[PDB]
Structures are given as C-alpha cells and as structure tokens.
Design an enzyme around this catalytic site. Structure first.
Site, mmCIF file in Angstrom:
data_model
loop_
_atom_site.group_PDB
_atom_site.id
_atom_site.type_symbol
_atom_site.label_atom_id
_atom_site.label_comp_id
_atom_site.label_asym_id
_atom_site.label_seq_id
_atom_site.Cartn_x
_atom_site.Cartn_y
_atom_site.Cartn_z
ATOM 1 N N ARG A 1 65.546 2.873 90.653
ATOM 2 C CA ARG A 1 66.569 3.916 90.666
ATOM 3 C C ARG A 1 66.674 4.631 89.326
ATOM 4 N NH1 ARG A 1 70.570 2.639 87.382
ATOM 5 N NH2 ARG A 1 70.855 0.414 86.898
ATOM 6 N N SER A 2 66.395 3.932 88.229
ATOM 7 C CA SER A 2 66.527 4.495 86.892
ATOM 8 C C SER A 2 65.343 4.019 86.072
ATOM 9 C CB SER A 2 67.849 4.066 86.243
ATOM 10 O OG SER A 2 68.029 4.669 84.975
ATOM 11 N N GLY A 3 64.567 4.960 85.546
ATOM 12 C CA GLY A 3 63.369 4.602 84.818
ATOM 13 C C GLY A 3 63.331 5.120 83.397
ATOM 14 N N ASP A 4 63.465 4.217 82.431
ATOM 15 C CA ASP A 4 63.228 4.553 81.030
ATOM 16 C C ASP A 4 61.727 4.747 80.844
ATOM 17 O OD1 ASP A 4 63.257 4.917 78.299
ATOM 18 O OD2 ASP A 4 64.621 3.240 77.904
ATOM 19 N N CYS B 1 67.850 -2.016 87.917
ATOM 20 C CA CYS B 1 67.090 -0.775 87.838
ATOM 21 C C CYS B 1 65.943 -0.763 88.838
ATOM 22 C CB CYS B 1 66.567 -0.565 86.417
ATOM 23 S SG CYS B 1 67.861 -0.072 85.275
ATOM 24 N N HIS B 2 65.149 -1.831 88.870
ATOM 25 C CA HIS B 2 64.187 -2.035 89.950
ATOM 26 C C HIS B 2 64.960 -2.712 91.073
ATOM 27 C CE1 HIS B 2 63.747 -4.744 86.490
ATOM 28 N NE2 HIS B 2 63.660 -5.748 87.344
ATOM 29 N N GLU C 1 59.892 -13.043 81.279
ATOM 30 C CA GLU C 1 61.026 -12.531 82.041
ATOM 31 C C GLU C 1 60.819 -12.720 83.538
ATOM 32 O OE1 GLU C 1 61.343 -8.555 83.073
ATOM 33 O OE2 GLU C 1 63.390 -8.280 82.322
ATOM 34 N N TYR D 1 64.497 9.577 77.033
ATOM 35 C CA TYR D 1 65.580 9.715 76.070
ATOM 36 C C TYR D 1 65.191 10.678 74.954
ATOM 37 C CZ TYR D 1 68.185 5.897 78.224
ATOM 38 O OH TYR D 1 68.908 5.118 79.098
ATOM 39 N N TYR E 1 68.957 -9.723 88.518
ATOM 40 C CA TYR E 1 67.722 -9.819 89.299
ATOM 41 C C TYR E 1 67.398 -11.249 89.708
ATOM 42 C CZ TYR E 1 67.056 -5.293 86.926
ATOM 43 O OH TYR E 1 67.216 -4.021 86.423
ATOM 44 N N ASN F 1 58.047 -2.400 83.464
ATOM 45 C CA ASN F 1 58.264 -2.683 84.880
ATOM 46 C C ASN F 1 56.983 -2.542 85.695
ATOM 47 O OD1 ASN F 1 61.364 -1.086 84.305
ATOM 48 N ND2 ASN F 1 61.122 -3.280 84.718
ATOM 49 N N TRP G 1 67.196 -8.826 76.697
ATOM 50 C CA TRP G 1 68.497 -8.828 77.353
ATOM 51 C C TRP G 1 69.628 -9.264 76.437
ATOM 52 C CZ3 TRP G 1 69.387 -6.311 81.622
ATOM 53 C CH2 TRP G 1 68.365 -6.139 82.565
ATOM 54 N N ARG H 1 74.847 7.520 80.462
ATOM 55 C CA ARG H 1 75.913 6.564 80.183
ATOM 56 C C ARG H 1 75.953 6.178 78.709
ATOM 57 N NH1 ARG H 1 75.175 1.227 79.487
ATOM 58 N NH2 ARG H 1 73.040 1.551 80.261
ATOM 59 N N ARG I 1 59.047 -5.515 107.312
ATOM 60 C CA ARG I 1 60.345 -5.796 106.710
ATOM 61 C C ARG I 1 60.232 -6.748 105.524
ATOM 62 N NH1 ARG I 1 60.806 -7.103 112.499
ATOM 63 N NH2 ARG I 1 61.829 -5.359 113.585
HETATM 64 N N1 LIG Z 1 67.761 1.880 77.979
HETATM 65 C C1 LIG Z 1 67.364 0.557 78.455
HETATM 66 N N2 LIG Z 1 68.224 -0.397 78.632
HETATM 67 C C2 LIG Z 1 67.716 -1.582 79.079
HETATM 68 N N3 LIG Z 1 68.443 -2.712 79.331
HETATM 69 C C3 LIG Z 1 67.589 -3.703 79.768
HETATM 70 C C4 LIG Z 1 66.299 -3.179 79.800
HETATM 71 C C5 LIG Z 1 65.047 -3.904 80.198
HETATM 72 C C6 LIG Z 1 64.172 -3.849 78.984
HETATM 73 C C7 LIG Z 1 64.763 -4.086 77.751
HETATM 74 C C8 LIG Z 1 64.002 -4.032 76.597
HETATM 75 C C9 LIG Z 1 62.651 -3.744 76.676
HETATM 76 C C10 LIG Z 1 61.869 -3.695 75.405
HETATM 77 O O1 LIG Z 1 62.369 -3.739 74.282
HETATM 78 N N4 LIG Z 1 60.568 -3.581 75.652
HETATM 79 C C11 LIG Z 1 59.481 -3.497 74.686
HETATM 80 C C12 LIG Z 1 58.229 -3.942 75.377
HETATM 81 C C13 LIG Z 1 57.552 -2.774 76.021
HETATM 82 C C14 LIG Z 1 56.649 -2.140 75.007
HETATM 83 O O2 LIG Z 1 56.404 -2.546 73.873
HETATM 84 O O3 LIG Z 1 56.123 -1.005 75.538
HETATM 85 C C15 LIG Z 1 59.751 -4.386 73.508
HETATM 86 O O4 LIG Z 1 59.890 -5.605 73.505
HETATM 87 O O5 LIG Z 1 59.845 -3.617 72.392
HETATM 88 C C16 LIG Z 1 62.047 -3.500 77.905
HETATM 89 C C17 LIG Z 1 62.815 -3.550 79.066
HETATM 90 C C18 LIG Z 1 66.378 -1.845 79.358
HETATM 91 C C19 LIG Z 1 65.404 -0.771 79.162
HETATM 92 O O6 LIG Z 1 64.188 -0.785 79.345
HETATM 93 N N5 LIG Z 1 66.021 0.363 78.712
HETATM 94 O O1 LIG Z 2 63.842 -2.805 84.148
HETATM 95 C C1 LIG Z 2 64.481 -1.895 83.626
HETATM 96 C C2 LIG Z 2 65.832 -2.015 83.095
HETATM 97 C C3 LIG Z 2 66.442 -0.947 82.531
HETATM 98 N N1 LIG Z 2 65.860 0.309 82.435
HETATM 99 C C4 LIG Z 2 66.628 1.445 81.790
HETATM 100 C C5 LIG Z 2 66.852 2.674 82.674
HETATM 101 C C6 LIG Z 2 68.013 3.318 81.931
HETATM 102 O O2 LIG Z 2 67.530 4.240 80.975
HETATM 103 C C7 LIG Z 2 68.749 2.142 81.266
HETATM 104 C C8 LIG Z 2 70.165 1.891 81.826
HETATM 105 O O3 LIG Z 2 70.287 2.116 83.223
HETATM 106 P P1 LIG Z 2 71.468 3.011 83.900
HETATM 107 O O4 LIG Z 2 72.456 1.879 84.507
HETATM 108 O O5 LIG Z 2 72.101 4.041 83.029
HETATM 109 O O6 LIG Z 2 70.734 3.581 85.230
HETATM 110 O O7 LIG Z 2 67.912 1.007 81.492
HETATM 111 C C9 LIG Z 2 64.546 0.489 82.931
HETATM 112 O O8 LIG Z 2 63.941 1.558 82.882
HETATM 113 N N2 LIG Z 2 63.924 -0.621 83.502
#
Ligand SMILES: Nc1nc2[nH]cc(Cc3ccc(C(=O)N[C@H](CCC(=O)O)C(=O)O)cc3)c2c(=O)[nH]1
Ligand SMILES: O=c1ccn([C@H]2C[C@H](O)[C@@H](COP(=O)(O)O)O2)c(=O)[nH]1
Ligand SMILES: Nc1nc2[nH]cc(Cc3ccc(C(=O)N[C@H](CCC(=O)O)C(=O)O)cc3)c2c(=O)[nH]1
Ligand SMILES: O=c1ccn([C@H]2C[C@H](O)[C@@H](COP(=O)(O)O)O2)c(=O)[nH]1
Lengths: 285, 285
Positions: free
Chosen positions: B187-190, B167-168, B59, B230, B107, B198, B81, B22, B148
């Site tokens: 469902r989607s894991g960065d 995502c979770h 969070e 990515y 959430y 997470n 966020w 996306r 359940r």
């Molecule tokens: N592509 C993508 N979009 C997102 N939208 C919302 C989130 C949740 C989220 C957003 C930011 C962070 C983040 O910036 N995390 C790191 C802490 C984790 C680390 O240092 O390993 C930070 O503060 O730099 C983590 C989860 C999220 C994600 O993970 N990936």
């Molecule tokens: O708790 C979270 C929130 C967001 N994402 C990442 C997964 C995707 O790379 C991105 C956006 O989600 P999509 O809607 O494209 O699935 O956020 C996580 O991995 N964990």
C-alpha cells in the site's frame, strides 16, 4: 493470594486520603497495611501485570555484591536507578562531587557494611562495617529460634549521603518447622510501580537464604507505612484491577549454592509465569 | 529485471506529483505500479546500491517466528524497527503503558495468529488465531490450483494497536508447471529505502516456501499502491540512477529443511552479490 495486593489497591482508591508528596505529583495515601504472601511451592510474581523479573533478579545480586554504582546495574540491562544517580537529580540535592552513579551508601552498602565510613562507590569496604546479610545467614544456621534475625537499611548517620533514603528499611526473618519466613517494613510504598517489584525482590531473597540454610520458604509478610497511589497511576491501576488473577509461577534453583555471594543469574528459572500485558506507569522523580 | 526498479524511480522523478505525508518530509508520489521480477536462477537483490541482506534475512525469520518484539530483532544486529518501537514514538500514538519496543500486532502476529487477541510482545499465542503462513503452505502442497492462497496482514480490528500498520499488507501465491510465484500488494512504498528491502524480502520468502513444497521459484510481482520518493532522497536516488546495474546474485539453501519454522540464518548463502557502494538515505517515520 494476589487479591491481597489488589485489595490494597482498591482500598486506597476508595478510602485513601489525598496527600501531597515531595515530587510534583499527587497521591492517595493510607498509613499502615499488612499482607501475607505464601512462598510455599509458588512465587509471588504478580499475574495481573508483567513484572520486570530480570530487574528483580539483577538488582538483588547487585545488592548482595554490595555495589552502590548505578552503572554496575545499568550494564546488566536494569536502568531503574539511573534516575536517582543522574547529574540532574544528584546536583539538585547538593550532591555535586559524584562521578557517575553514586547513589551514596544505599541498600547494597548497608546490607554488607553497616556503620562503615562511606568514601565513594569504588572504594573497598571489605572487613568494614557490620555484614548484616551474612550475620543473618549465620544466625539462622546456628540459632534459628533467635528473634533478632534482622537486616536493617535505615541508617540516620548515612541518611543525608543517599540520593534516596531506603524505602524497604527493615526486614526480619523467622524460622519454625524448617520454614523460613520474612517480614519487610516498607516505610513508603509506590503501590503502582515499586510495590510489585519489592514483593518479588524480598520473596526471591527468602528463596536464596532458604536454599543456603537448607530450609523451605514459608511466608512473606509485607508491612507498609505510607502506602500511596500516585494520581498519574489511577487509570492504569483501574485497568489492572479489572484483570482476573492467574496462578502464581514457581521459582526453581538450578544448582546447589553454598555461599550467598556465589549466586549467578543463570541459577534461577521462573517456571509457568503467564502474566497479563505489561502496564508501564510513570515514575515520580 | 533491476532496470524495472530503476524505471520506476525515473518515472516518479519525471511524472510524480508533490504530496505531503504523515512524517511531514514531503514526497513525490505515483499511485499504482507493477513490476515482475524473475526468481529463476537469480535473486532480486539490488546492485545499484548495497541492500542490507542480513536485515532481510533476520527480519523474515523474525516475521516467521511471529515475534513483534523490536528488541528481539535489534539483539540480532537489525535496528530497522527500533525507531518505530522507541518510547518517544510509542507515547505519541497513545501507547503509554507498552514496553519499549512493543510494535503491537504487526506482520509477525498477523501471519501466525490472525484474529487472536494481542496481549503484548512476550505473551504466548500458540494455538490462537489463524496460521496464514502454514495454511498457504498446506494449500500449495494439496491444492496448487487454488486461487485463494493468500496471506493478509491488514487487520482493521487490530489496526489501532499497531505502531506502524502493514505496508506490505497482502500477498498471494500461485502455482503452475511446478513454479511457485508470488504477488505482493504494498500500500505504501518507500522507493528509496523500503522498496528494495521488500523486493528482496518477499523474494526470499518465495524461495523458502518453494523449498518446502518442492517447487521452483517463478516470478515475484511487485504491485505498489502509494509509490513515493521522499524529498531528502531525490539527490541520493539521482546518483543511483546513473549507476549501471550488475547481474543479480543467486540464493543457495545449504540444507534441506522440512518446516518453515526450522529455517535458520546459517542455512542461506547469497552467491555473487557485487553491488555498488552504499547510499545512506534518511528514514522518515
Ligand atoms: N519511511 C520508512 N519508515 C519505515 N518504518 C519501518 C520501515 C521498514 C524498514 C526500515 C528501515 C530500513 C532500512 O534502514 N533499510 C536499509 C537497508 C536497505 C538498503 O541498504 O538499501 C538499512 O539498513 O539502511 C528498511 C525498511 C520503514 C521504511 O522502509 N521506511
Ligand atoms: O516494509 C516497509 C515498511 C515501511 N515502508 C515505508 C512506506 C512509508 O514511506 C513509511 C510509512 O508508511 P505510511 O504509514 O505513511 O504509509 O514506511 C516501506 O516502504 N516498506
Ligand atoms: N516514585 C518512585 N520512585 C522510585 N525510585 C526508585 C524506585 C524503585 C523502582 C524504580 C523503578 C522500577 C521500575 O522501573 N519497575 C518496572 C517493573 C516494576 C514492576 O513491574 O512492579 C520496570 O523495570 O519496568 C521499580 C522500582 C521508585 C519507585 O518505585 N517509585
Ligand atoms: O523499593 C522501593 C523504592 C522506592 N519506592 C518509592 C516510594 C516513593 O513513592 C518513592 C520515594 O520517595 P519518598 O517516599 O522517599 O519521598 O519511591 C518504593 O515504593 N519501593
């Protein structure tokens, strides 16, 4: 009593005439309206949409302090005047010598130093000009039956030096049966965006002046000149119009304050404000 | 058990397929993975890279509180966020009347008020919707053999109102031999950014719910749907893969807390977290 504002919105949508404006947008306009909002045991903070009450409270303290610096208000979290104090908007109207946030001699300057020679937003004006705000409080204390209790912000001399000429130009106070009432003449009313903000602003101003003079809040009469609804507000306002109003909240003063300058943000508490969701509407600059 | 997360990184880099996304930044994706992280005398805070533990702690308290206001979390120092709650991102999804940082029913709202009608981020929802979080704690105390004990945040009805769908999405709890275990379906894991966050998040949630119900933390099963890396994370993750993991830290709760709402940030202390230097990875959103 909120139906009065809604009745003004529905009357402009049904009977208002199309009319151009200075901004590149469009309006439906009606000239000459008047509504009466009771301040007795209730505060006219609209419930069909959440109104920025922190913006209302911080901007009024910014007016009372006499500040014309937009950065002074923006440092509090209220950035509603940064658009009129920005370089892009200031330099378009010939204001090229401003620093940052010089709106000119605006509501804060005219309330406390009417007629004084405006230098910049940082200069000291203590003792200069007419202190309309303090004179209004003094008249209410000594001669409440006086029919000249007026605080006017429309100054044709300082008009070309303002980024935006005053919309709430003139307001008058009135005392009977120990009830302080207030009427505001708004020359131009953004019905969708500014009017709910302006109603709460001058309602709060009446509460503060009633707290100092030892009077009870009475009515707030909202008199409009050019009451307009911008074209890019029709859909958000038609959604607000279908919402059922809820009872107005209440405004509580948490401590006895002697002077108008000694009011702090922590002295006010809105009790029981349950509005409908916010409806962000685009501003026309 | 951190070698499992590294084993998932190495499997996506070696067997993952290229796939668009996306955000348009491209990913290497693998569908369907599962790892089991033991919570017994160890906390899954990754050591091959420093994880934002203050963000994890604030969070989750923000989730438990049911808040969906991004400014409420950003006022604590966690700006994860703010990108999804910005005016630019809100207007791109058709949300033009929302306030800056209104993520919608996300959430926090689904955990405490599932099915309730979302007004905005400042409205009160006490008593509205289903309290999944308290219901799972009640079920664990009374009927631990129940199959359940599920807390679901994926709501197709409220889905078009979310700035970012969960995502979770779904997590399940499980009790045996006085051991509270938890499985999360993401469902989607960065894999580079969110997955370590997470894993620590739901491990912390399991410790909190086990502290209330009087159980010991068991396992945390991390089940992934679209596990992706990515393109701008391949080099930063290939550097993290060459780093040797260090022993997991421990999580200590400094006071006995009775209700899930009464947990404060000062009640938790991570002991013995010696991670490698941070590896900044750009977010795609
Ligand atoms: N592509 C993508 N979009 C997102 N939208 C919302 C989130 C949740 C989220 C957003 C930011 C962070 C983040 O910036 N995390 C790191 C802490 C984790 C680390 O240092 O390993 C930070 O503060 O730099 C983590 C989860 C999220 C994600 O993970 N990936
Ligand atoms: O708790 C979270 C929130 C967001 N994402 C990442 C997964 C995707 O790379 C991105 C956006 O989600 P999509 O809607 O494209 O699935 O956020 C996580 O991995 N964990
Ligand atoms: N076309 C137009 N130009 C303006 N320039 C300055 C103002 C006064 C003003 C400007 C901004 C706001 C504003 O942003 N208001 C809302 C709350 C106002 C409300 O709820 O009525 C906010 O801060 O979110 C309010 C008044 C104003 C206005 O009303 N309309
Ligand atoms: O307190 C205020 C300040 C501004 N405006 C709106 C009215 C107009 O739409 C705009 C100013 O433009 P003119 O009427 O000066 O052209 O700001 C208000 O309604 N109330």
């Amino acid at each position: 009593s909120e139906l009065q504002y809604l009745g003004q919105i529905q009357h402009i949508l049904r009977c208002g005439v199309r009319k151009d404006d200075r901004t590149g947008t469009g309006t439906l306009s009606v000239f000459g309206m008047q509504a009466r909002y009771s301040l007795r045991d209730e505060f006219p903070l609209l419930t069909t949409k959440r109104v920025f009450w922190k913006g209302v409270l911080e901007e009024l303290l910014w007016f009372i302090k006499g500040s014309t610096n937009a950065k002074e208000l923006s440092s509090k979290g209220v950035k509603i005047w940064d658009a009129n104090g920005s370089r892009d908007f200031l330099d378009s109207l010939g204001f090229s010598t401003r620093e940052e946030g010089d709106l000119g001699p605006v509501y804060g300057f005219q309330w406390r130093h009417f007629g004084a020679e405006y230098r910049d937003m940082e200069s000291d004006y203590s003792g200069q000009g007419v202190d309309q705000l303090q004179r209004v409080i003094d008249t209410i204390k000594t001669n409440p039956d006086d029919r000249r209790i007026i605080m006017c912000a429309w100054n044709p001399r300082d008009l070309p030096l303002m980024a935006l000429p005053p919309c709430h130009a003139l307001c008058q106070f009135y005392v009977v049966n120990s009830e302080l009432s207030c009427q505001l003449y708004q020359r131009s009313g953004d019905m969708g965006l500014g009017v709910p903000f302006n109603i709460a602003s001058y309602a709060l101003l009446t509460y503060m002046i009633a707290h100092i003079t030892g009077l009870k809040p009475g009515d707030f009469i909202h008199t409009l000149g050019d009451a307009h609804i911008y074209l890019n507000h029709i859909e958000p306002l038609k959604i607000q119009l279908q919402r059922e109003p809820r009872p107005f909240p209440k405004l509580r003063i948490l401590r006895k304050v002697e002077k108008i300058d000694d009011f702090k943000a922590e002295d006010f508490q809105i009790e029981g404000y349950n509005p409908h969701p916010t409806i962000k509407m685009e501003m026309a600059v």
